[PDB]
Amino acid sequence: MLETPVTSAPIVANYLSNLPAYRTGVAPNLRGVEIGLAHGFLLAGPFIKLGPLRNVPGAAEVVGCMSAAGLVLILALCLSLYGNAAFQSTQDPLMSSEGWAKFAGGFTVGGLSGVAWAYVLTQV
Amino acid sequence: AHVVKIYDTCIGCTQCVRACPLDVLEMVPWDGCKAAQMASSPRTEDCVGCKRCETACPTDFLSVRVYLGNESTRSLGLAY
Amino acid sequence: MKDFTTYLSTAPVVGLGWAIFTSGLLIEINRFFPDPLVFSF
Amino acid sequence: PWKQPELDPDTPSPIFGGSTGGLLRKAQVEEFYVTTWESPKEQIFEMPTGGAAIMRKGPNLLKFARKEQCLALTTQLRTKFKMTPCFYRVYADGKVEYLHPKDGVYPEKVNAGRVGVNQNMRSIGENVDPIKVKFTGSQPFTI
Amino acid sequence: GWVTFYWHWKHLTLWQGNVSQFDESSTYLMGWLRDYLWLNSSQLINGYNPFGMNSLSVWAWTFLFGHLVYATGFMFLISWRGYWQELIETLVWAHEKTPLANLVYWKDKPVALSIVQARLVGLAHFSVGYIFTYAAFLIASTSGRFG
Amino acid sequence: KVKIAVDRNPVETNFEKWAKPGHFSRALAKGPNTTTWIWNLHADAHDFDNHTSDLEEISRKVFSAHFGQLGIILIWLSGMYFHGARFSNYEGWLSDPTHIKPSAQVVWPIVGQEILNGDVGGGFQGIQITSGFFQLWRASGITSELQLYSTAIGGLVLAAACFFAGWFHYHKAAPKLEWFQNVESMLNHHLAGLLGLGSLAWAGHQIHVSLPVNKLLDAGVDPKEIPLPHEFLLNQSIIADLYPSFSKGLAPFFTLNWAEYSDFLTFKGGLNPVTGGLWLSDTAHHHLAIAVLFLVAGHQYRTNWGIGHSIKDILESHKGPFTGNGHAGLYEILTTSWHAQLAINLALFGSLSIIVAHHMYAMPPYPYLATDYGTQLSLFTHHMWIGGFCVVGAGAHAAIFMVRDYDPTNNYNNLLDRVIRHRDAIISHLNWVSIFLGFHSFGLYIHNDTMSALGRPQDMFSDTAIQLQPVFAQWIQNTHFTAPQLTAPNALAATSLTWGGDVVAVGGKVAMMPIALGTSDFLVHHIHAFTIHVTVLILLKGVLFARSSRLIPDKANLGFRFPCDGPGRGGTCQVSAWDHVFLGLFWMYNSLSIVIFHFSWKMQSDVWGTVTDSGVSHITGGNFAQSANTINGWLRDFLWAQSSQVIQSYGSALSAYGLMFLGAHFVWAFSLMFLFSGRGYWQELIESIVWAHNKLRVAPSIQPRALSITQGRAVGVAHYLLGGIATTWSFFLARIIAVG
Amino acid sequence: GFIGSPTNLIMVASTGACLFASRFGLAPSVRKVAQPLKLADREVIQTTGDPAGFTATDVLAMGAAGHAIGVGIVLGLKGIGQL
Ligand code: CLA
Ligand code: CLA
Ligand code: CLA
Ligand code: CLA
Ligand SMILES: CC1=C(/C=C/C(C)=C\C=C/C(C)=C/C=C/C=C(C)/C=C/C=C(C)/C=C/C2=C(C)CCCC2(C)C)C(C)(C)CCC1
Ligand SMILES: CC1=C(C/C=C(\C)CCC[C@H](C)CCC[C@H](C)CCCC(C)C)C(=O)c2ccccc2C1=O
């Protein structure tokens, strides 16, 4: 109820409007793909930096990439669990059960694609 | 929700209803007391079990008793 | 006088008086009988 | 009272800014409570969900998420200005329930029209032991 | 704890051969704190250090672990329900009124733990920390200098 | 407009109310019937807001109580000076301050406690004092015991005068409410007279008395052969020989040629190499400048002569667009509510005490103060704890003001109303900040401990593996080391030795030296910030939710100090603002304990020690760079490596520290039964004891009852704080006296 | 201090300028109020023969201000090597 200049800013409003979570202009698969790509690309960062094999060149990036892929898979499993255990009962298709399942599938597809993209960028 | 039970030792002093912060008790006509009033709980589903009515009871032991159990959204005092 | 006496008749004041009396008695006993342990007349 | 009043959503709210401890998502999922009163003049009162507001000269309508907040506002208005307000409960489907003045005379009075329920007719301490009521689902105080 | 302190100190002084140390040291609590809880804990605390590590590193780690669970028991026993319930209400508002995170929701409303539940959780943390701390100290002191 | 308003004899000096214990409140006026009355007698004694609703009587009681506390303080100071006059070796300490320990408390040989009178040196036996009173008296020019005797007698006389003043200003001539409400006159007189005039008087004492005595003491002459301060005051030849500018005789002051005063009003920032303290000329010019600034500031507010500033006009004028009524109703709040002023005073007093502790360990403003490591450690810890207690009492009395003296009529859209209106966002953001700080500090510590126990020193957050160096603190240290070089060229050296430079040592012991900052220092500083943030969150949640909340909407009607609201809504135990302060007291204790542990370890490892020809050999050998990064390092290299002096102190003069250590452990453990448990168990136990005494017909007429839940919480937190404080006190003092 | 010294001359000039400012608008005084401009106020203190709002506290305040400005100017000019 308490409106604030930062919450009601038009720049903030249009920045949150075109986000994949609040766009409401596409299938949940595309939003999940974008979410997985972005979050996997950022999550690969701390893993290629400070892992136990960070002193060993070459293998550090590979180990961090598989750790990021495992974290992405764990997040996808928790997303699927939340979708199955949250929307099991009675206009946005994301809030639906199978819509959230498709969102989770897009999320894991985007996560592995972003992990592979981060591996390519670190190799180059 | 919780269970509010009122016994015949009540003197109809209306202190429990004034101490109630959720409007659970009420005063009904009676003949077993000098004040001709008896406490009732027609809205026990809204009681949270705060035991504020028991503090205001002037009689020895308690003429009104609150027993907790089977908490709900109204009984847990949740605004969410 | 009697109001001050009843103030002195209050429980903390007489407790303080007992405290000084008992502490002084035990301290003077310990001072004039340095470190005893066993009753030997 | 003689006739149960009907709430009016078009009644003006008291002059107030933005509240942080206001209605949450439970207001659009479960029931929420609405308090109405009749202020003869404009004055400043303290809400239980935040700071202070100013009521308008006329009908005044406020919304809360808890019945305890509604009764706290009711007793504050009765003790400070003798306002005698009344709050309804509105569910998600729009069902309106009259809550505080069930007979319109407030629970401090009697009105000789309320049937006393949940009243044990025995003295406290005369209840049976829990061994007497076992594997039955009936508490010693529920008989 | 008292009976195990007595058993451990008496038996340790018997195995070391310095029974006179226990005889002249268990009289006063400085002896209990220094000759038992401080003298015999030298090998325990040196399990891991910047110098290196000996075989009692796991015992030092679980000793600090037990002290930590003791502190969490103090947390769940000292503070009571009203403060945590109000804090949970504020966190509920924070989760409700945020972008990019209010899309998710809880199936069950988060509430503070019950007072009986709080007593049980504090008791469990207290006893777990007690058991782990004394087991660590006992095993590290009896095995670090004997066999 | 501003004038003295005094009522003549409103209260008669009669002992008729001393006989009745419960008289200030009508609840206790009926007499006692249970034992919980007695505690209620000792709990509502100073609750003057509950005794009467009249602000004038409350203000008169506050004035009288302040006079009584000043009398008590002056009695304590006079007793300290008397103990320094008679049962002390101050004259022996003046001959050789680097070899005779300061002692001012002597015990009576009664039951073997005469072993506490240790060999402090100078042919004296007593307890080694850590108050630093010897260094304060040396900084004040005190030489003989006659001056200490005169100061003690004057302190007793002024204490009696203040005690009579309290009696007079309450019973005989009681000021009215309009007299107390003149905040502009109070501020003007306090800025100009209480602070500025006292600063000028102390500056004049330093110029005319303290500087020549300190200069002659640093010259190495006999203190008995030092001329008396009145010889410097009257005869100008000695003061001209010691300082040629005194030969001018007030000429440069009234001719604006103040540079001629540069010989005895210096700017040589740093430590005096002779004594390891601050330069007395620098302190003289400092107090003179402070006096000038405060006399300037004391002519700011308008009282009776047209010119000046109006506090209400200033507060109402400072209103922005994002705040609505900016500082609108605060003038009426602070002129009617005593508790708001109490919160402000306690917060600023505690913060200033913390500042005093930090800037006193940094610059020792006393001769031979830094050499005495125990005095510096005790003073830092004492001011630290007093500041913490004051800043938690600030939150307590702010919550009391929120419950009692808050009026929604005067706060519609002002700043307090908007703070209440977004308190939930405030508490949520503070909770997130506290959780993030605790994670990224304590989890870092746990990470270091695990990777140390896993045999991975290269995976640790240490000074050798992962360099999380404090680049901002190091940059500030480097900039302040170059402060006299470019930005303050008139200073001879740096303002303190902590920024950098060389090592200043006195008598072979290092007085001050540069302090290096590493990853462990960053970790402990962020830990301190986290603990302060959590305590701030607790106290702010207590203050802002004192009136109402989502859980309890009518918390204001329940009062400030209530135990609970029953087990309803899941349970409302410890929901009051008083319980919030009771919870935050432990967090303040934990924060300040970690702070003083960091101070003691850091100054023992990287500051204190001895100075040999090879270099500076510290007390602990500088292990803080390698041991402070893990919890086990604090467990072993700080708590177990130290505290061996406390446990081995038996049979020596330090054995009282070990006994006090054991008693403090006892009180800390005994507090937990009040912190845990409840009331019904002890009530039924008391019922059983009542049955036992009724069998023997020795049941008291006053019914024994268990302590209240609020009372039990208060007893628990008080015994817990006392036990922890005395444990740290005994351990710190024994360690710093035996090895220091 | 010394009669004829530059410091004496400029501090006498500063004190006289402060007094002249207080006499005619300019510097705020006992009879001058408000933050942006100066508005007439009550006489507060009898001026004892002085025309307009010029009382004893006015000359005390503005003599103090003139001495402060003069000593600040003197020490600032001495710091920069000037008069
Ligand atoms: C420049 C004048 C002056 C001075 C020096 C003081 C000094 C003081 N005031 Mg006060 N005050 C003044 C004017 C002054 N006041 C005016 C004009 C008002 C009315 C608007 C007040 C209203 C006021 C209140 C409401 C309170 C104080 C309090 C205090 C004390 C603060 C505690 C402290 O710092 O301890 C410093 C202590 C010392 C330096 C020790 C020596 C103290 C000596 C005896 C005081 C001498 C100064 C005295 C004002 C001279 C006039 C009194 C004379 C008739 C004998 C302190 C003694 C507090 C108090 O009650 O404390 C008792 C308090 O609550 N003041
Ligand atoms: C509060 C602080 C303080 C005090 C008390 C003093 C006091 C003193 N200083 Mg110091 N001084 C100070 C601050 C202070 N100064 C500061 C800040 C500086 C700046 C650097 C100096 C710099 C300085 C220098 C350089 C010298 C002094 C000197 C002096 C002495 C000369 C006094 C004088 O002529 O002044 C003016 C004093 C009066 C006008 C007297 C006051 C009026 C009297 C009390 C009236 C009494 C009337 C009474 C009713 C009648 C008597 C009653 C009886 C019959 C019962 C004096 C002992 C000089 C010195 O020691 O040589 C002697 C000296 O060389 N001082
Ligand atoms: C500037 C100083 C100052 C002043 C003037 C006040 C004034 C007041 N406070 Mg505040 N307070 C302060 C500082 C101050 N406080 C600080 C620093 C704290 C934090 C510790 C608090 C915490 C606090 C709370 C939590 C409460 C108050 C309350 C009160 C009121 C009554 C106090 C009373 O009756 O106590 C009577 C005196 C006692 C109860 C004695 C206390 C003794 C303590 C517990 C133990 C002392 C240990 C001692 C150091 C060592 C003993 C060892 C032993 C072996 C002898 C009064 C308005 C109460 C109130 O109702 O406010 C309106 C209240 O609930 N205050
Ligand atoms: C050492 C014991 C301990 C610990 C860990 C905590 C932890 C906490 N308390 Mg505290 N508390 C304690 C004792 C303790 N308390 C005691 C004794 C009291 C009584 C005075 C209190 C009183 C108290 C109050 C009054 C408040 C807290 C708050 C908090 C929270 C602050 C979060 C934070 O900054 O750290 C983050 C948490 C940690 C660093 C925990 C350390 C454990 C590791 C490092 C985390 C990861 C563990 C592991 C890797 C994951 C395992 C996964 C799976 C196997 C389980 C957090 C939940 C505040 C709150 O609610 O939040 C702001 C608050 O208001 N507590
Ligand atoms: C025109 C006229 C006239 C004249 C007048 C005159 C001429 C006057 C003057 C006056 C004056 C001429 C005054 C002055 C004053 C001054 C002052 C008052 C100042 C100061 C003071 C002080 C005290 C100071 C201080 C200080 C110091 C020391 C340090 C710091 C700074 C300062 C400076 C602040 C006649 C009457 C004939 C006639 C009519 C008109
Ligand atoms: C133990 C306990 C009690 C019982 C404690 C009581 C009744 C207080 C007892 C105080 C005693 C009477 C103080 C005096 C003790 C000695 C008799 C005095 C000194 C004697 C020597 C000088 C000889 C509570 O009432 C309680 C309430 C709420 C939370 C926790 C607790 C709690 O832990």
Ligand code: SF4
């Ligand atoms: S408070 Fe007790 S006696 Fe009074 S009306 Fe209620 S049940 Fe009856």
